[PDB]
Amino acid sequence: HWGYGKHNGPEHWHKDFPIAKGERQSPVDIDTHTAKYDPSLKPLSVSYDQATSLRILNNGHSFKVEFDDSQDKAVLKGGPLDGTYRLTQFHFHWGSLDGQGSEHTVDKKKYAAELHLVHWNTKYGDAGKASQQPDGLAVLGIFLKVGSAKPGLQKVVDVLDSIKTKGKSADFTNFDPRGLLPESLDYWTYPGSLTTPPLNECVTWIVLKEPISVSSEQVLKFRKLNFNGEGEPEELMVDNWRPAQPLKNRQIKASFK
Numbered sequence: 001h002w003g004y005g006k007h008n009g010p011e012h013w014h015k016d017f018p019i020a021k022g023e024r025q026s027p028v029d030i031d032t033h034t035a036k037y038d039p040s041l042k043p044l045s046v047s048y049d050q051a052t053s054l055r056i057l058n059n060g061h062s063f064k065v066e067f068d069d070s071q072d073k074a075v076l077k078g079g080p081l082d083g084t085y086r087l088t089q090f091h092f093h094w095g096s097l098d099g100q101g102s103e104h105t106v107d108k109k110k111y112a113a114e115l116h117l118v119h120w121n122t123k124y125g126d127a128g129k130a131s132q133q134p135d136g137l138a139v140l141g142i143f144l145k146v147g148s149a150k151p152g153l154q155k156v157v158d159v160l161d162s163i164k165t166k167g168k169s170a171d172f173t174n175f176d177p178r179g180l181l182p183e184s185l186d187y188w189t190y191p192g193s194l195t196t197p198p199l200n201e202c203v204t205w206i207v208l209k210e211p212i213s214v215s216s217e218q219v220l221k222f223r224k225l226n227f228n229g230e231g232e233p234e235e236l237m238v239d240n241w242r243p244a245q246p247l248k249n250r251q252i253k254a255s256f257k
C-alpha cells in the first residue's frame with residue numbers, strides 16, 4: 001500500500017495511479033517572477049464564521065480535522081472560482097526537519113509544512129462525486145514557517161497525543177479554522193490535482209502568498225505522530241509530502257502585484 005517511504009513513496013505511485021504522470025499534477029514549484037498578474041481575478045471570499053468541526057483522526061498518511069459539510073456553513077467563493085465550495089476537512093504535510101515539509105514550493109523554497117483546507121463544489125452534492133470532476137475541489141494552500149507560535153493552531157497540537165497511531169480518532173468540536181489564516185489573502189492559482197493517491201485531476205489550487213508562523217514546539221508535536229497502527233513497527237509520520245511535479249502547459253495566475 002502507498003506511503004512516503006523508499007519502497008511505496010511518490011516515485012512508485014504511478015503504478016497504481018497512472019494519472020501520477022498526467023497533464024495537471026500537483027504540487028508545483030511556484031515561479032513568482034513567472035506567475036501572471038490577473039487584475040481580473042476577484043478577492044477570495046472565505047466565509048468560515050459558521051464552521052462546525054466534528055472530529056480529528058490519524059489516517060496513517062496525515063491527520064485530518066473533519067467538518068460538518070451537510071449545509072452551507074464554511075464556504076470559499078470568488079477568486080478564480082465559479083459558484084460555491086464547501087469546507088469538508090483540513091490536514092497538513094510536514095518535514096523531518098524545518099527546511100522541508102511543504103508540497104508546493106516558492107522559487108524552489110520549501111517551507112516546514114503546508115496546510116490544506118479542502119473544499120468541494122456544491123453543484124456536485126458531495127466531496128466523493130466532486131472528486132470525479134475537473135472543477136470539483138478547491139484547496140486553499142497555506143505555508144507554515146517556523147518562528148513565533150500560531151495561537152489558533154494550539155488547540156490542534158494539544159490533542160495530537162490522543163491520535164498518535166493510524167486509525168485513532170477523537171471528537172474535535174468548536175475549532176475555528178479562521179485562526180489558521182494569515183493576514184493577507186493574496187494568492188496564486190492554477191489547475192492541478194490531489195497530491196496523494198488517487199491523484200485525481202479535480203483541484204483548483206489557491207495558494208496563499210503569506211505564510212503563517214508556527215513555533216518549533218508546535219511542529220515538533222506533528223513529528224511525534226506515527227504512520228503505523230498501534231502494535232505495528234514504529235515509523236514516525238514525517239516527510240509526508242509529494243515533491244513538485246512538472247508544470248507542463250499550465251500558467252500560474254497571481255491575484256496581486
Ligand SMILES: Cc1cc(C)nc(Sc2c(F)c(F)c(S(N)(=O)=O)c(F)c2F)n1
Nearest residue numbers: 116118127128131139194195196197198
Ligand atoms: C474529496 C476527496 C474525496 C475522496 C474520495 N478522496 C479524497 S482523498 C484526498 C487526497 F488524495 C488529497 F491528495 C488531498 S490534497 N493533499 O489536499 O490534495 C485531499 F484533500 C484529499 F481529501 N478526497
Ligand SMILES: [Zn+2]
Nearest residue numbers: 091093116195
Ligand atoms: Zn494535502
